[PDB]
């Protein structure tokens, strides 16, 4: 029979596999739609949540009760030392999706970036990219890299820059840098490839990506809370005090 009184469902099925994230960084999963009319620009950045504080500001919202009034608002500080661009990836559209076509890494990859490739940096010989960096210097390798860039130019539909954070500028225990692919939007493939090539090994401050008073998206991993019951996890109604085998449960 129908339930006695209507009540909305507890929790959402849109976030349903309530499991620990398979990643720690938090991946973009969707970059802004690229239009060639815009100038060449980056679409993402990596920061570190430092803490919260609150501000005071005068509101400029006409028709509101707080128009030309001073309000306090909670704000979050996200420390953002400049990223360093170390690679370029091209993707090609196929009837099965986007696939990675070619990856070109810069010479002189920083040690903090290189730590990402090692689980045990202490015991390693730090051999990563040491044979790759030689083809930036020999003639045949340079011709091969020019061929790779030409192929990206004439085949890839979207390109991204592999950029890493600078953990040496942060007060944390971690020294291993964070790498991510930031899609380059706004231009033709040749133009964004030239832009990325000139930005190889370079520093991109957060000024060049984001601006004042604009709405952005924050992608991350929430605070872990461990194994939790239904009352904390799904915010269901607690059973009465007289319940025998436990009241922090779902009855049916």
């Amino acid at each position: 029979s129908h339930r006695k009184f209507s009540a909305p469902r507890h929790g959402s099925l849109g976030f349903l596999p309530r499991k620990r994230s398979s990643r720690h960084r938090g991946k973009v999963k969707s970059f802004p739609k690229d239009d060639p009319s815009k100038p060449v620009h980056l679409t993402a950045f990596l920061g570190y949540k430092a803490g919260m504080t609150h501000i005071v500001r005068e509101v400029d919202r006409p028709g509101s009760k707080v128009n030309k009034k001073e309000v306090v608002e909670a704000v979050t500080i996200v420390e953002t030392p400049p990223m360093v661009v170390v690679g370029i990836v091209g993707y090609v559209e196929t009837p099965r999706g986007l696939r990675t076509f070619k990856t070109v890494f810069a010479e002189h990859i920083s040690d903090e970036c290189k730590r990402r490739f090692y689980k045990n940096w202490h015991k390693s010989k730090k051999k990563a990219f040491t044979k790759y960096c030689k083809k930036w210097q020999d003639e045949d390798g340079k011709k091969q890299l020019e061929k790779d860039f030409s192929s990206m130019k004439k085949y890839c539909q979207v390109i991204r820059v592999i950029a890493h954070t600078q953990m040496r500028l942060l007060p944390l225990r971690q020294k291993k840098a964070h790498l991510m692919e930031i899609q380059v939007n706004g231009g033709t493939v040749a133009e964004k490839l030239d832009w990325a090539r000139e930005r190889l090994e370079q520093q991109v401050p957060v000024n060049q990506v984001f601006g004042q008073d604009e709405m952005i998206d924050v992608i991350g991993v929430t605070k872990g809370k461990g194994y939790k019951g239904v009352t904390s996890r799904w915010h269901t109604k607690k059973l009465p005090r007289k319940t025998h085998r436990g009241l922090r449960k779902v009855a049916c």
Binding site: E93, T94, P95, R96, G97
Partner: protein, 201 residues
Amino acid sequence: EVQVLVLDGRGHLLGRLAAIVAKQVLLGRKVVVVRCEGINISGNFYRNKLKYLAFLRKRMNTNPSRGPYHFRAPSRIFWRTVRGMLPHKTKRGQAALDRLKVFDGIPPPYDKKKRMVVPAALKVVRLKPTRKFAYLGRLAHEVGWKYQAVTATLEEKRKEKAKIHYRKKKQLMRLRKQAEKNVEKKIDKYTEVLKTHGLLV
């Protein structure tokens, strides 16, 4: 036979083509179907879209992840139609289903090969001209397929390359006809041999 039978899905009716393909792969033959977005289904587009949406509604109430898997690409739709005509829960049916490859568009292995056509599954002979029909590519796109546009662009590129190849082939055929005209007294001894036995009217 021994070679891989490559069929072009354009202009073919879904069930007729699937029945032919199922029998072929059960007879030990290897079949590759290309351009599954060009496959037609009899009946108007709204009729067929309602059929696929009714299929979409069939999911396991307890766990849709366990439930029926509704594939959205036209190649996968045709593949599931063939699987419905194979005994796929036995080893023989599974091997037969392994012998079948289905593609949207035409990938590079088969874009430079000749494509067969199955007349018994062709819309032009199997449907009355006044009847409505539906396109598998459009149906897939409207039930959830995501690669209709990129497949269209790649198909246009492939068609341009094939046009270039065909123009070269026509040039070679013209040149061969000219060569046959040029050597006539030196060929007519064997041309009459072919003519008396019916080759080369």
